[PDB]
């Protein structure tokens, strides 16, 4: 048993000005992150759009896929197109 030091925090900013803090692993998928946002905010994953430096985050990819590091900040908008 050797320690895993990969666990980190990232931040998610919303249009209300609120900053959410998440407990994640670099190998987490975007869905996992969306699931974590739901636990904190009560927003269903299907209603979430995540953005990192202007790039939309696709569900099946991982945080490390986007070079999202410790203390990184993500942006969250709802899907309300009508």
């Amino acid at each position: 048993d050797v320690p895993d030091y990969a666990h980190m925090q990232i931040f998610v900013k919303t249009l209300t000005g609120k900053t959410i803090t998440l407990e994640v692993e670099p190998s987490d998928t975007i869905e996992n992150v969306k699931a974590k946002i739901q636990d904190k905010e009560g927003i269903p994953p299907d209603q979430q759009r995540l953005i990192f430096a202007g790039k939309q985050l696709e569900d099946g990819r991982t945080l490390s896929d986007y070079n999202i590091q410790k203390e990184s900040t993500l942006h969250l908008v709802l899907r309300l197109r009508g």
Partner: protein, 231 residues
Amino acid sequence: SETSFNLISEKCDILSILRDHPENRIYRRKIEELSKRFTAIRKTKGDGNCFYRALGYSYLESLLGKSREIFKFKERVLQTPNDLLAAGFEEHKFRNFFNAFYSVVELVEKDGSVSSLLKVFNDQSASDHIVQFLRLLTSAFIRNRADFFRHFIDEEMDIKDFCTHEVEPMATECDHIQITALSQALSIALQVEYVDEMDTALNHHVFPEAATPSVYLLYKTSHYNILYAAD
């Protein structure tokens, strides 16, 4: 001048929309559930402008008979040209749209009725002019706060390009950014009821958070209709 309801429809009891989903148990269930909190509905035309038309009509309709609230909103509407100028819109280009909106506000102020308000919002030219004004004001709000909103745009698209192509033109569908921007631009407290075909619980979103809404909208099949809350 014949009476029309092609853009903003007549008001019906909420369970009327069960007729739109005769064979979907999930929709029926959700609609029945909605009826616990909402008594009636108005439909808006499915032309891409549905959100802007709905918010405008329903918010103005909620002002009818409220002299104090009307006056305070009129004062705010009077400051909106300055907002438009600051964002680089030109007075000679926004004039007719601002005019249409100020005119309908005055109609509400001078003891308007639901009936006369409906006549304006069902008049194609005057209704579309009101929508176009709301679109410009939404664009101005975003442009004047580009440093904040740029972080929330995907496909590495420029803010200015976003407003130019997805906020300003008629018939372009709204989304979260537009919605919260307009709500903030006019201080209209809005609640959106989210209704999909997934076998899930209902949820809603309030703009701004924890405000007492004056407008309730039903978001379903990528479309916005107007709800009326029970007492």
